[PDB]
DNA sequence: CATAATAACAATA
DNA sequence: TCATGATATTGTTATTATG
DNA sequence: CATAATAACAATA
DNA sequence: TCATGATATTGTTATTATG
């Protein structure tokens, strides 16, 4: 427990923030660095309660999710100016009530999703886009190749993927590679952080493996190696987004935008309708070809989006 | 909050013990009015920290699943003879790592079988078995056929169950009909307690109402019909048990025994592979047909247990 | 000289 | 299963009384 | 006289 | 997503500087 401490992101990003030629101002990023400045010397608990009681007055008419991850960003910045023992992590939190009401949000519309499921009827046409863009000369379309053909997330494709050949008894897998780098994992022991587990993959794994050393040895392709997720974020979400509407924008089904993140749901999907065993459930190899936490089932429920053309076709050939 | 009461079921069940030809003595029940019993007078606090702590010092040596249940029940005495708002209710309860466990080795129980699904080989002649019950002259008999064919719980078939013909456009349906009587909803008001829903049935309707009409006008249907879950319990539950057992024991998978809940299950699979809309997920329907809380889809994972022997064949012609 | 009856004991949803 | 701090079911076995 | 750049704002897993 | 009290991602839009 030390009173005394400064959040240096926080306050670095602001630093770099004043030679902006043209954009918001970072007020936000302002109020955390005022608030931890603030919380230097401070050892009443009743103070510290007035202070994020400000803070909190101040968050005011933003919505549930938003004030949700301004807190999340308070307390990383309190973690890294003070420590995990600071008391002020006991005070500078959500109270309960918002993060049931959160979680009852989100699990009514994943269950809103799975009563009325989306048919990709065009679901061929986009994994012909990706493994089209595995081809490319262009290093943000072969990253959307890959998110289209190994399924994995915008990030770890961009910034931290390692893919390797699959060895299928005394030879190399056609349909799976080897891949590390997991996101999301928040280092827990149950997880696959850097656990190097197989995934398939909806092309030969030759022209996915070669396509990300395309990827790799280029320039921005060093520049995004091992980049934070702000760096990724500031760097490329927008373009990513842009060029993803556009390139699907015509296959892509008509009850939602295409965006980057459905590549990897429609993934599983495809996946599963390909190299699913009989004795496993969806659930099951959704989580496993997912990456996700070890006995967990539930965060499966949540890319379970389409389905598939066939499907819906034998499932009224069945009636 | 009162000081005096008395939990008449418990009592009620010793005054009743006292006739008994043969079995056990009732300790636990006799724990429990001793327990309610020392309850009366009581103010401080610290006093029923003490007796709760007798208590807990006595069920030393049972498993994790029984203390809970017992637990359960201590909870509901203390209930029945204070009311809600007894203080004691913050007291005797387990602490919070014990349920924090009991939910891990649920869950990794239930993410074991998603990963090593049975295949139910012969669910065809266990069909076969419950349509033949169906037209028993032995309620028993017709029971076992009603778990296997409306996949309704045992306590649901016997005690409750409101079967109903289902309008199909200007007529009645003959592949599902309605259902009231829902158990275990704990009266939540999300949940289907006097609900009527429609259900699917694996057999023709009209054989399933006759049946239960049947079932019903019976003398055996006459006492079963509005018991309490002990009644019931004490009353059929093992020779249910035994004549479930006998029924398949040559047809049931041989890896496990045949339970009659298992007839559930195996229902949720088989309906899920024959009447499922191509828009929804398995989870959905399962949730939908068992008739679960609103917006979950968790409860559904305990049900996935089978693999259909069609779906192990076809899921092994593509590969 | 042995079996059925009962509730404890236990796991599932 | 409903809620996420537990309850309500379903499943198994030791112990007891009894010509 | 208008567009791109940036971080706020927001939702998903 | 990992834990079940939240965090780490991915997705959208208002605001600002700038010949
Ligand atoms: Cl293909
Ligand atoms: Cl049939
Ligand atoms: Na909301
Ligand atoms: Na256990």
Redesign the interface.
Known sequence: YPKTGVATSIVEKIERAEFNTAGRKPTVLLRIADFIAAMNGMDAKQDMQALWDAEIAIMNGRAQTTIISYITKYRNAIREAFGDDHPMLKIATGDAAMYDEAR?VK??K??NK????I?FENYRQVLKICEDCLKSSDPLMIGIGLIGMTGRAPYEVFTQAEFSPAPYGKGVSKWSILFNGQAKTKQGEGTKFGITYEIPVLTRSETVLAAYKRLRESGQGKLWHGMSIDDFSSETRLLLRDTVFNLFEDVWPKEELPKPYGLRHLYAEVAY??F?????????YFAAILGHN?????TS?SY?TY?LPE???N??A?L
């Open positions: 009852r699990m009514e994943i269950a799975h009563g009325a499921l048919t309708h390909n699913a065993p009989p004795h496993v459930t969806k659930n099951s070890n006995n967990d089932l539930e429920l379970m389905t499907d819906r076709d499932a009224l069945r």
